Design a binder for this molecule. Structure first.
Ligand SMILES: *[C@@H]1O[C@H](CO)[C@@H](O[C@@H]2O[C@H](CO)[C@@H](O)[C@H](O)[C@H]2NC(C)=O)[C@H](O)[C@H]1NC(C)=O
Ligand SMILES: *[C@@H]1O[C@H](CO)[C@@H](O[C@@H]2O[C@H](CO)[C@@H](O)[C@H](O)[C@H]2NC(C)=O)[C@H](O)[C@H]1NC(C)=O
Ligand SMILES: *[C@@H]1O[C@H](CO)[C@@H](O)[C@H](O)[C@H]1NC(C)=O
Ligand SMILES: *[C@@H]1O[C@H](CO)[C@@H](O)[C@H](O)[C@H]1NC(C)=O
Lengths: 596, 194
């Protein structure tokens, strides 16, 4: 118990310095992200360099403590968080090589351009370009060439870079008691504590498989219905028993199916609920939306908003000689400072992204009492999971007519629910197989089970075996299809969007059960419910102080992930889809390709 | 007749640090406290032992005034039977206290853009404070078995840390000014009343 005292008296000084340094860095960043100029960028760089150097030096200094003689778990987690900094634990030349490889990969991805094969002088980019042509166009050959050109001009350049990047990342990973750049990523899903509460990185690879195996049939039903509906547009290319081509899924990669709604409306003879004219004619400004969100949040027992929030937050575009970065975000400046940056228009999607950001801000406000190296989420998916349930809650017609946006005599019909459920499904359940595939492929490439020869042949068979998507043209071992994605070529993990989707419906079901709500789960509103807010606040009061198993149990009472709430949310849609698919084939075969 | 110099304590331009808080004696000085009570300027006026309403009849020999500046979330530590960083190494009150404290915000007169690092507070010390004691020492704190040699390094720290007051921080981080009044009934004749 002699190292205990030394660690305790060192963490205090570390916290005292880190608070000020982080506040300076965050303030510089916020100042740049509103009044963009060259001096502001210089100030950002000079503020961030000092914080990075201080953090690295403090980690190196603390690397003379040992986790085995520390029995208090409160400071053991802090020491583990501070010591785990194995990004510079490599030779300088190798580090410079790695950085230049990331830089050149990013430049190739951003600068990449493809040209019209019939009009040479028109060449397009991704953001003002190919993305729009996939979102809107319908012609088969147009989508085909736009897909193939991007695949052939990104992969050809990013193949050897990725090939020689894998070995460098494995070398970096096998210096922190890790076997590859796999387990290193999975190490966030780590917990320690009482009996039955531990969670290592090898259980995630089984929990994910179990959850996907339970999920699959609903995706099969949705895929069969989409395949049956997608024959009045291309009645010469779709096989009733086969799969779906990759260049017809409303997106460049197939990440989201939300762009297939106009071609797959269940009942197209009635518009969906879009309350925008109601706010336009009632005289609503940017501040009223945030006041309504504040009222909704205080209704459930959560605290008010800080006075400085209403003065230091840019809730609308200045509309002058001040160009800004217009992207919604929530900031935690530190030292009790909370701000929200977002361009606000009088429209419904802004009305929802305001609730999302205020949920983030409340979650940040909750754990301000914890030590410095404990103020974060719990499983890298809790933030957006907490922030996205408010969007679901504040979109029910009952909530809309309870605030003065719908007539009091509005009677909700039944045909609209099928449309809304299908629209939600095309975004929620139509992306899980893609995420599971991408993450498993990356893991098994990093481990070494895929050699260089099977690098691009396993991918284009796992896709048809899991997702149900086949390529329109054959691809040899000179392409790099996964590299043509932002999250793959920019070192971003790809399990958050699966884990968040799993937790969201568990949280929603627990909160709705606490509120004593009868009826379907998709018409639930947690307003005027103090017990639900109390349970949520009891959850979001710890941060990283306790293992995330306790955080999950504080709300749902479960020790691990569960998918039954997700299926319960989509019961009427499943019944309707089963009723519609009486004279159609449900599954698919993997021995069909539109080039043989 | 004489008034009493409470305007040189509450209305002073410069206050002292927590580890070097000033102390002032009240002489044979006719004082009034209801004027202090009926002023909507203090965020904390709670009195232990005596009641503020019937505080113009009691007579005392000497009255002590102590002043310093602390953070917003540290006023609760200026109270008998309290434990924390402030009331263990900087300023500690006894359990038989018979006076009371005054606190109010000082953000506008104490915060500057970029940081005001003129206020410092003790962070490391061996023993407790032995209430109503001050210590002004810059000796290097020794944590490990290896002795320090007047230089900062491993397990050797400087036991002084400065505040980071800024005009944008939250209420729990805005600076607060604290004035503590203590009354003693000595064996000398009660010299002044209200
Ligand atoms: C939550 O409760 C509040 C009051 O506790 C409701 O506000 C009132 O709602 C009634 C409708 O029954 C109106 O006639 C009042 O004018 C409202 N008063 C105020 C001050 O808003 C609120 O409607 C409830 N919300 C939900 C979703 O049930
Ligand atoms: C410190 O000095 C100020 C004057 O600058 C005093 O302000 C008093 O303010 C109230 C209302 O704000 C007035 O009604 C008084 O007349 C003011 N006093 C004087 C003497 O002008 C303030 O009271 C002083 N502080 C103390 C503790 O006496
Ligand atoms: C933006 O920065 C410039 C200098 O970089 C400064 O002159 C100007 O006042 C700033 N504008 C605002 C609104 O802060
Ligand atoms: C531990 O301390 C020694 C000197 O006491 C220092 O040389 C060494 O670098 C420290 N450990 C690490 C990992 O830096």
């Amino acid at each position: 118990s002699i190292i205990e005292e030394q660690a305790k008296t060192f963490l205090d000084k570390f916290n005292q310095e880190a608070e000020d340094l982080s506040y300076q860095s965050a303030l510089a960043s916020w100042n740049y992200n509103t009044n963009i100029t060259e001096e502001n960028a210089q100030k950002m760089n000079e503020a961030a360099a000092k914080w990075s150097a201080f953090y690295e030096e403090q980690s190196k200094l603390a690397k003379n403590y040992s986790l085995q003689e520390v029995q208090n778990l409160t400071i053991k987690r802090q020491l583990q968080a501070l010591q785990q900094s194995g990004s510079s634990a490599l030779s300088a030349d190798k580090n410079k090589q790695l950085n230049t490889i990331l830089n050149t990969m990013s430049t190739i991805y951003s600068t990449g351009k493809v040209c019209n094969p019939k009009n040479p002088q028109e060449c397009l980019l991704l953001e003002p370009g190919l993305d729009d042509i996939m979102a809107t166009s319908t012609d088969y050959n147009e989508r085909l060439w736009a897909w193939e050109g991007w695949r052939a001009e990104v992969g050809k350049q990013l193949r050897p870079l990725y090939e020689e990047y894998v070995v460098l990342k494995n070398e970096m990973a096998r210096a922190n008691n890790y076997e590859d750049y796999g387990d290193y990523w999975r190490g966030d899903y780590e917990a320690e504590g009482a009996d039955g509460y531990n969670y290592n990185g090898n259980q995630l690879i089984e929990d994910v498989e179990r959850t996907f195996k339970e999920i699959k049939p609903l995706y099969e039903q949705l895929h069969a219905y989409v395949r049956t509906k997608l024959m009045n547009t291309y009645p010469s290319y779709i096989s009733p028993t086969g799969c779906l081509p990759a260049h017809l899924l409303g997106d460049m990669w197939g990440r989201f199916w939300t762009n297939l709604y106009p071609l797959t409306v269940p009942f197209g003879q009635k518009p969906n609920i879009d309350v925008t004219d109601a706010m336009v004619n009632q005289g609503w400004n940017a501040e009223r939306i945030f006041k309504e969100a504040e009222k909704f949040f205080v209704s459930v027992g959560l605290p008010y908003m800080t006075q400085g929030f209403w003065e230091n937050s840019m809730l609308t575009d200045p509309g002058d000689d001040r160009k800004v970065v217009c992207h919604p975000t929530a900031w935690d400046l530190g030292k009790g400072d909370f701000r929200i940056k977002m361009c606000t228009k009088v429209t419904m999607d802004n009305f929802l992204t305001a609730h999302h950001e205020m949920g983030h801000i409340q979650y940040d406000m909750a754990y301000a009492t914890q030590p410095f190296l404990l103020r974060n989420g719990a499983n890298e998916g809790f933030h957006e999971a907490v922030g996205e349930i408010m969007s679901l809650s504040a979109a029910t017609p009952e909530h809309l007519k309870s605030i003065g946006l719908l007539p009091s005599d509005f009677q909700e019909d039944n045909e609209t629910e099928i449309n809304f459920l299908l629209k939600q499904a095309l975004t929620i359940v139509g992306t899980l197989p893609f995420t599971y595939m991408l993450e498993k492929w990356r893991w098994m490439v990093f481990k070494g089970d895929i050699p260089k020869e099977q690098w691009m042949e396993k991918w284009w068979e796992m896709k048809r075996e899991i997702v149900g998507v086949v390529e329109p043209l054959p691809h040899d071992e000179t392409y790099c299809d996964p590299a043509a994605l932002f999250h793959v070529s920019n070192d971003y993990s790809f399990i958050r969007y699966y884990t968040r989707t799993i937790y969201q419906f568990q949280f929603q079901e627990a909160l709705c059960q606490a509120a004593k709500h009868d009826g379907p789960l998709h018409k639930c509103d947690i307003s005027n419910s103090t017990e639900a807010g109390q349970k949520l606040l009891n959850m979001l009061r710890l941060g990283k102080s306790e293992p995330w198993t306790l955080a999950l149990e504080n709300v749902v009472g479960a020790r691990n992930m569960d998918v039954r709430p997700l299926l319960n949310y989509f019961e009427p849609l499943s019944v309707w889809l089963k009723e519609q698919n009486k004279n159609s084939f449900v599954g698919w075969n993997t021995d069909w390709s539109p080039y043989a | 007749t004489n008034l009493c110099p409470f305007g040189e304590v509450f209305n002073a331009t410069r206050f002292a640090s927590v580890y070097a808080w000033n102390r002032k004696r009240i002489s044979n000085c006719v004082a009034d406290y209801s004027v202090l009570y009926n002023s909507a300027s203090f965020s904390t006026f709670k009195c232990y032992g005596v009641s503020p309403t019937k505080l113009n009849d009691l007579c005392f020999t000497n009255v002590y005034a102590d002043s310093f500046v602390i953070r917003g979330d540290e006023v609760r530590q200026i109270a008998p039977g309290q434990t924390g960083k402030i009331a263990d190494y900087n300023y500690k009150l006894p359990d038989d206290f018979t006076g009371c404290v005054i606190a109010w915000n000082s953000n506008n007169l104490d915060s500057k853009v970029g940081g005001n690092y003129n206020y410092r507070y003790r962070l490391f010390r061996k023993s407790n404070l032995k209430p109503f004691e001050r210590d002004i020492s810059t000796e290097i704190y020794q944590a490990g078995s290896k002795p320090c040699n007047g230089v900062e390094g491993f397990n050797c720290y400087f036991p002084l840390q400065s505040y980071g007051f800024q005009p944008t921080n939250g209420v729990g981080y805005q600076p607060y000014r604290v004035v503590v009044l203590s009354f003693e009934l000595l064996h000398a004749p009660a010299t002044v009343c209200g």
